Amino acid sequence: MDTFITRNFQTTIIQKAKNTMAEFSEDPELQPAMLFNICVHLEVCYVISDMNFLDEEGKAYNLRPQYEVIEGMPRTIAWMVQRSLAQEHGIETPKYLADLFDYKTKRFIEVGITKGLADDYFWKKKEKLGNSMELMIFSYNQDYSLSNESSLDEEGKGRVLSRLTELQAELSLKNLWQVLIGEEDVEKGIDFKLGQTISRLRDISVPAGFSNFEGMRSYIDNIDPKGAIERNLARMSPLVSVTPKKLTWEDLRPIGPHIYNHELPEVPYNAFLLMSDELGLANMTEGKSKKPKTLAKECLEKYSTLRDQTDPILIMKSEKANENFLWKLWRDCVNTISNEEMSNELQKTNYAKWATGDGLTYQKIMKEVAIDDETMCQEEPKIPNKCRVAAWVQTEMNLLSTLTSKRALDLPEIGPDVAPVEHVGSERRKYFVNEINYCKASTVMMKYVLFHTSLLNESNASMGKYKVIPITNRVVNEKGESFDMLYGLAVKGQSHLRGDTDVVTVVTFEFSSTDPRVDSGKWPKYTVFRIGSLFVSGREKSVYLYCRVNGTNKIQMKWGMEARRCLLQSMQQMEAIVEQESSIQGYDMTKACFKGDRVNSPKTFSIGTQEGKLVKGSFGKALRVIFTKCLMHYVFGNAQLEGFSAESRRLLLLIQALKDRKGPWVFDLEGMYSGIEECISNNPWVIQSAYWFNEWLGFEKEGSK
Amino acid sequence: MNINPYFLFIDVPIQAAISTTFPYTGVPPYSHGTGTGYTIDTVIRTHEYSNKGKQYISDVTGCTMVDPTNGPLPEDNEPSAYAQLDCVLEALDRMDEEHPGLFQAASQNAMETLMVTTVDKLTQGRQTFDWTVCRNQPAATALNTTITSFRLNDLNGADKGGLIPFCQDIIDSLDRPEMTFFSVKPMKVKDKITKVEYIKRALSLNTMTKDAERGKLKRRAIATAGIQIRGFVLVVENLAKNICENLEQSGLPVGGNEKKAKLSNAVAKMLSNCPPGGISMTVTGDNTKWNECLNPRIFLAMTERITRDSPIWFRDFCSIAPVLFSNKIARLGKGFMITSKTKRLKAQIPCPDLFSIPLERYNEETRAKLKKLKPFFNEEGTASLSPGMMMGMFNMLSTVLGVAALGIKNIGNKEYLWDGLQSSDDFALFVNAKDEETCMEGINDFYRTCKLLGINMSKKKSYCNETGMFEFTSMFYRDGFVSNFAMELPSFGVAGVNESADMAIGMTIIKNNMINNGMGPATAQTAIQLFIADYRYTYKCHRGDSKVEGKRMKIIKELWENTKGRDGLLVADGGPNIYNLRNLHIPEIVLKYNLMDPEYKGRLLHPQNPFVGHLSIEGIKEMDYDAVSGTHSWRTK
RNA sequence: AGCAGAAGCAGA
């Protein structure tokens, strides 16, 4: 139909109509229908003003016509010029859009091209408008209706009638007349009367000081409130001020100083699974990813000595932990995983019931009974405890960022690269994976994701059964050998999870080589037995079983299944840096970034401290550190971390501004400090982030000199 | 040696590595249990900033109404909703002067769009508060229920098809002495309510805790409105959007590349317009209690002024929405749980019975909350919330107000100019003067002006620094180089429809996230790898040569051995992954078609395959996707 | 117990 539209209308008409549509924001392709109408409208509004001009005195027949078109041009310009004419000629301005203006009667023309009878359409247009404008309605059935006598002579009327003569039949002969939509449809809704009740609501919805809505409308329409802002500001109290204050390195005091107070207990270990102290029993395999139960059975068979232990030495007991019950549960787990039965279900026994916390939820009663009772009161909410810095977090960060002789990632393949963009992408992935894959953090993340996947599957499919879920991983060393690592066993309790936040308890028994007594404060939550010893590096290293009761909901499990996203957060990050160094150089800097070249030396990043002295590491080391930071954000993520990061971002930006000598100012520094500090309660990562922020702020202060 | 991640910033700018400070890999915070506490907190805070205003009793619903506008000017730095009508009118008039004809043109545009708009448009919204059942339901379901209810009460305006008759029926419904509606009690039933009860329900709001919000230690409540006001809010927002589109300082509605372009252009324009020897300073601001402090009556005045030269009927139509909002009523949610630990018993007290027990049995926080809520409480469990904008829904109009505030540019002919960008509740204010002290003076004047219009800049979260670096809606600018729009990268997991449309959806989402949101080539390729890994794990269709064992994987291995041309196999059948950045948009089946041998190609492209079965226009396309009706287009049970 | 953190879950 567009090819047909172009026939009757020149490019300028089509583009003007399309632009007028563009000020409507409905897909022009969707309905050319009204497009037709408007262009026709536009066309007639031009033919009425084709050769009719006026002279400097009023001669009807120089640089002035007797008409001026409004339609087609931008709405804002059209309205501004319409208002200009209205104020210049001292005539009432129509409240609707004007389509054409006359220079002799000094009145605003309205034109309507309708399908059928004209007089009824003329009366409907009057209903819309009334007498604010003179109406010139035309209809293809040789119909016309003009509200003014001498608006235009017979020549123009005949010309427009002839111009519509083709469109009254030309569309039909080529079979287009049928789908021609009318012109009143786009303006069917004009009548809108408010009811009594809504009128009263509007009346009581007036700003204070006005009797009713009519008074408010009159005031807003009539009074000119010039100088109101200046007057009110002048009479406003000076106490309402932003209190500017130029920022200086002195104002930046350490955040959350209470973490240096030794009275508060040191923040304890709370991660779901052991991260750096994990001890994986390794079994050599060359293929098949056998069942988790079968894999655990085989791994324990290889180490029957540890499996067959039955007289443990209780090393640490948690405050509210039943050592006998935990040991019985562990023995039940080992026996069930080592049996010939495929099923890994545990009978709901007394110690299992206690460890899973069977039958602890409070019973629900009718509201009336509770209301009658007096001893029933809303419990005071539990507030997170305040804790101080702990060195175990620093040890975790140091150890998990160190390279290891293993590979946990087994990412799949992609199609061969062709274009340069995929070539550079492949190069970047090659380098980033070559660096990350050999880090402990990657293996820890793989363990987390696999365990969470298995836990979610078991909880969803075995809601009403106690299940033992081995903590398993698949690893490959640099030499191509494949190992299956068994880190521990997990008991899954009842998982009738209805809400997203419903909690299912999991009892984790994880192997480890660290003696808890080395750092007692790190293990107040963990019941630790000494299950045996192993020969590793010429020494009989003790092997302990860290037993703990933890809990997770559906959301945490689903996010654990997606822990791989950490990679992305790291990757993007470093990619940005690479992109930045490309901008400075104009060509791919990936190779120069990682390994350097004859032109640009390899990049280095300030990494940490050694004997109180700043030290620098390679690009790969920084990549691994930020990756472990992302993994930590996962494992220790909660509302406290979100709040702390959000509130400390502002302080970081202020420090950056100070470094750039951008003389930053602040308006309420104490408020920002309080907002930052209120989030530092018990999250180990948050506390260590506060400590590192203090240290780095000190180093930046030293450098600023 | 002790590692220190923050030491990275010593060698790299913070903005360049800002992504490190965003903990988007962690589990987002989630709310547990009732949201009544947060809703009551919001109500109390809203009434606290306006208690000094005129207090009266509504004569239509009987609720307590607090009106702060035209109230006493604030005397402290605490949030103040005592906006002055005269100042708002002055700001709007100045903006009109700077944009001649913009207001009336936008009013006409919105009015015509509203003519052409149909009732079905209302189905495009998100969850809405259905009043027939008093719960949050999809927009289409709420629209259907309300239309049927109106049919029962002789309100057949929706039959006409246009939005105007539907909204006319909406307003006329408030006049009916009694209303009959379809309720669910589960089975369908007819229930009758009185005029006042229907009015309260229509004006009522549903409240729920916001879940998965990032960067906020404490949860906050959000509000969903009814279906009655959706048309009026829609037209008001269209009008405000039309105004915003033409406003240079409006940081809306486009996002992405145009956002960075607008930031850079504003910064450069601002530097260039600096008097020689002067200084330019940028204030990154954050609006505290943005929703709470804004008053619906101010928006009513805004609509009245915007439609100065518009037909009376359209003026009424625009004015309706502020009127209903100013009389809005908030539902308090599920209630509170009271427990006896000695007996291990719990009991839920719903909102209507909130005061049915002595307040001594509540904790301190809830005790104070209810004590302050008492006056605004209603017997049925809802609270009068005449001030405030808890639901938002006026992002465009609020942005217009903020831009108008930004349009003053000077007070008392002082030696400083100010402009900037405004977007909802965030803004960046650039000020030029001869010295930094004068810039701070101008910023103080701007703060007072914003106070005057019901906007409270947050002194705790805002800051200022010499022009050249700043932040705006999570977009960080530093010497031209804009870091990125930090957005929660999603889980490139199984889309969850079938085998083939699943891959189509995955690759399309990767492509879109690359093209619209920020993601580079290596990140996108790692995204493809992760998605393929998850897909293969979910469907158990690992590579044919992959020695993983499984029930279906056994037949897959048999296929692999049988197959001669392994290049042309779909990953759904253990085939190699061929996708990359180049061929992201092309379906895999067409990619491999030239490679697949007839031995299996014929079976895959079986016309009467017994899996797809009867299809529907929605099935193949329903976001939309491209696929082939092969053996991997099967459906659920 | 535990998860967890201004309020819940630890089946209905």
C-alpha closest to that of B87 among A222, A225, A216? A225
- Amino acid at residue number B100: P
Reported as half-sphere exposure (CB side, CA atoms, 13 A), residue B378 has a value of 22
Q: What is the distance between the alpha carbons of residues B407 and B401, in angstroms, rounded to a whole number?
A: 10
- Amino acid at residue number B368: A
CB contact under 8 A, B460 and A671: yes
Question: Rounded to an integer, what is the distance from CA A8 to the centroid of its chain?
Answer: 50
C-alpha closest to that of A642 among B26, B462, B475? B26
Closest B-chain CA to A678: B217
* Closest-CA distance of chain A to residue B120, Å: 15
- Asked if the C-beta of A482 comes within 8 angstroms of chain B's C-beta atoms, the answer is no
Reported as half-sphere exposure (CB side, CA atoms, 13 A), residue B261 has a value of 7
For B484-542, the DSSP string reads EE----------SS-SHHHHHHHHHHHHHHHHTS---HHHHHHHHHHHHHHHHHHHT--
Task: Specify the 3-state DSSP secondary structure of A100.
Answer: strand
Q: How far is CA A531 from CA A214, A275, A298, A326, A541, in A?
A: 86, 20, 18, 13, 11
Tell me which of A554, A665, A668, A682 to substitute to probe the interface with B (most B C-beta atoms closer than 10 Å): A665
Per the listing, tokens 């229907």 go with B198
CB contacts under 8 A, A 224-263 vs B, are 224-230, 232-233, 235-237, 239-244, 246-247
Q: Which two tokens stand for residue A583?
A: 């901008």
Decide the pairing of beta strands A100-102 and A108-114. antiparallel
Q: What is the distance between the alpha carbons of residues A147 and A32, in angstroms, rounded to a whole number?
A: 30
Closest B-chain CA to A652: B14
Q: How far is the CA of A494 from the C1' of C4 (A)?
A: 18
Cα separation of the two ends of chain B: 59
**DSSP assigned state of A268:** P
C-alpha closest to that of B591 among B606, B562, B573, B569? B569
Q: What is the distance between the alpha carbons of residues B371 and B365, in angstroms, rounded to a whole number?
A: 10
C-alpha closest to that of B589 among B637, B625, B556, B622? B625
β partners of residue B329: B204, B384
The answer on whether B426 is annotated among ligand-binding residues is yes
Question: Rounded to an integer, what is the distance from CA B78 to the centroid of its chain?
Answer: 27
* Closest partner CB to B412 (pick from A224, A225, A230): A230
CB contact under 8 A, B19 and A572: yes
Q: How far is CA A614 from CA A10, A607, A617, A688, B263, in A?
A: 74, 8, 10, 18, 37
* Closest-CA distance of chain B to residue A529, Å: 30
C-alpha closest to that of A137 among A127, A124, A150? A124
Pick out the residues of the known binding site of A for Mn(2+): 41, 71, 99, 110-111
C-alpha closest to that of A546 among A579, A500, A569, A513? A513
List of residues 6+ apart from B634 with CB closer than 8 A:
B498, B499, B611, B612, B613
Please indicate the experimental technique that yielded this structure: cryo-EM
Q: What is the distance between the alpha carbons of residues B111 and B316, in angstroms, rounded to a whole number?
A: 12
**DSSP assigned state of B327:** T
Largest Cα span, chain A: 121
Q: What is the distance between the alpha carbons of residues B220 and B134, in angstroms, rounded to a whole number?
A: 21
List of residues 6+ apart from A409 with CB closer than 8 A:
A433, A436, A437, A442, A446
CB A366, CB B347: distance < 8 Å: yes
* Closest-CA distance of chain A to residue B525, Å: 7
C-alpha closest to that of A491 among A415, A537, A547? A547
CB A472, CB A486: distance < 8 Å: yes
- Asked if the C-beta of A192 comes within 8 angstroms of chain B's C-beta atoms, the answer is yes
Q: How far is the CA of A260 from the C1' of C6 (A)?
A: 26
Q: What is the distance between the alpha carbons of residues A112 and A99, in angstroms, rounded to a whole number?
A: 10
User: What is the torsional sign of CA B233, B234, B239, B243?
Assistant: positive
Q: How far is CA B575 from CA B492, B504, B571, B592, B595, in A?
A: 20, 16, 4, 10, 12
CB B162, CB B172: distance < 8 Å: no
For residue B476, give the H/E element and its range: strand B475-478
Task: Specify the 3-state DSSP secondary structure of A180.
Answer: coil
The answer on whether B285 is annotated among ligand-binding residues is yes
From chain A, the residues in CB contact with B314 under 8 A are 192
Q: What is the distance between the alpha carbons of residues B122 and B229, in angstroms, rounded to a whole number?
A: 10
Task: Specify the 3-state DSSP secondary structure of B52.
Answer: coil
CB B184, CB B152: distance < 8 Å: no
Q: How far is CA A41 from CA A11, A32, A38, A83, B468, in A?
A: 16, 14, 5, 22, 51
Tell me which of B7, B341, B513, B528 to substitute to probe the interface with A (most A C-beta atoms closer than 10 Å): B7
C-alpha closest to that of A142 among A125, A123, A167? A167
Q: How far is the CA of A365 from the C1' of C11 (A)?
A: 16
* Closest-CA distance of chain B to residue A102, Å: 21
From chain B, the residues in CB contact with A696 under 8 A are 4, 6-7, 9-10
Q: What is the distance between the alpha carbons of residues B170 and B513, in angstroms, rounded to a whole number?
A: 40
Question: Which backbone phi and psi does B196 adopt, to 5 degrees?
Answer: -65, -45
Report CA Rg, chain B. 29
CB contact under 8 A, B174 and A367: no
Closest A-chain CA to B325: A205
Per the listing, tokens 């398993």 go with A472
Q: How far is the CA of A506 from the C1' of C10 (A)?
A: 12
Q: How far is the CA of A356 from the C1' of C1 (A)?
A: 8
Question: Any alpha helices (H) in A67-153, and if so which ranges?
Answer: 75-89, 119-129
Q: What is the distance between the alpha carbons of residues B83 and B297, in angstroms, rounded to a whole number?
A: 10
CB A675, CB A647: distance < 8 Å: yes
CB A252, CB A655: distance < 8 Å: yes
C-alpha closest to that of B476 among B514, B520, B428, B443? B428
Task: Specify the 3-state DSSP secondary structure of A60.
Answer: strand
* Closest partner CB to A97 (pick from B108, B322, B443): B108
C-alpha closest to that of B25 among A167, A41, A512, A645? A645
Q: What's this structure's resolution in Å?
A: 3.6
The count of CB pairs under 8 A between chains A and B is 559
For B427-441, the DSSP string reads EEEEEEESSHHHHHH
The answer on whether B286 is annotated among ligand-binding residues is yes
Q: What is the distance between the alpha carbons of residues B341 and B346, in angstroms, rounded to a whole number?
A: 8
**DSSP assigned state of B118:** B
CB B366, CB B209: distance < 8 Å: no
Q: How far is the CA of A385 from the C1' of C5 (A)?
A: 10
Nearest nt (C1') to A319 (CA)? C1
Tell me which of B38, B57, B200, B217 to substitute to probe the interface with A (most A C-beta atoms closer than 10 Å): B217
List of residues 6+ apart from B614 with CB closer than 8 A:
none
Q: What is the distance between the alpha carbons of residues A390 and A264, in angstroms, rounded to a whole number?
A: 11
Closest A-chain CA to B311: A95
What angle separates helix B312-326 from helix A196-204, to the nearest 10 degrees? 70
Decide the pairing of beta strands B329-331 and B382-384. antiparallel
Give the angle A353-A358-A361 at the CA atoms, nearest 5°. Answer: 160
Q: What is the distance between the alpha carbons of residues A142 and A193, in angstroms, rounded to a whole number?
A: 36
Q: Which two tokens stand for residue A62?
A: 């120089």
C-alpha closest to that of B378 among B135, B61, B143, B22? B61
Question: Which backbone phi and psi does B362 adopt, to 5 degrees?
Answer: -90, 160
List of residues 6+ apart from A42 with CB closer than 8 A:
A13, A16, A17, A20, A71, A72
- Asked if the C-beta of A584 comes within 8 angstroms of chain B's C-beta atoms, the answer is no
From chain A, the residues in CB contact with B359 under 8 A are none
CB contact under 8 A, A414 and B532: yes
Closest A-chain CA to B465: A664
Q: What is the distance between the alpha carbons of residues B569 and B557, in angstroms, rounded to a whole number?
A: 13
Closest B-chain CA to A556: B27
User: What is the torsional sign of CA A504, A509, A511, A516?
Assistant: positive
Decide the pairing of beta strands A363-364 and B345-349. parallel
In residues, how long is chain A? 705
* Closest partner CB to B16 (pick from A197, A576, A665): A576
β partners of residue B67: B54
Q: What is the distance between the alpha carbons of residues A552 and A501, in angstroms, rounded to a whole number?
A: 8
Nearest nt (C1') to A494 (CA)? C11
Query: Which nucleotides of strand C are protein-proximal, with an atom < 7 A from a CB?
Result: 1-12
* Cβ neighbours around B619 below 10 Å, total: 17
Closest B-chain CA to A20: B109
Task: Specify the 3-state DSSP secondary structure of B257.
Answer: helix
Q: What is the distance between the alpha carbons of residues B197 and B178, in angstroms, rounded to a whole number?
A: 9
List of residues 6+ apart from A412 with CB closer than 8 A:
B529, B532, B533, B536, B543, B577
- Asked if the C-beta of A191 comes within 8 angstroms of chain B's C-beta atoms, the answer is yes
Give the angle A572-A576-A579 at the CA atoms, nearest 5°. Answer: 130
* Closest-CA distance of chain A to residue B608, Å: 31
Q: What is the distance between the alpha carbons of residues A455 and B114, in angstroms, rounded to a whole number?
A: 53
From chain A, the residues in CB contact with B528 under 8 A are 414
* Closest-CA distance of chain B to residue A162, Å: 31
Give the angle A647-B17-A429 at the CA atoms, nearest 5°. Answer: 135
Q: How far is the CA of A700 from the C1' of C3 (A)?
A: 40
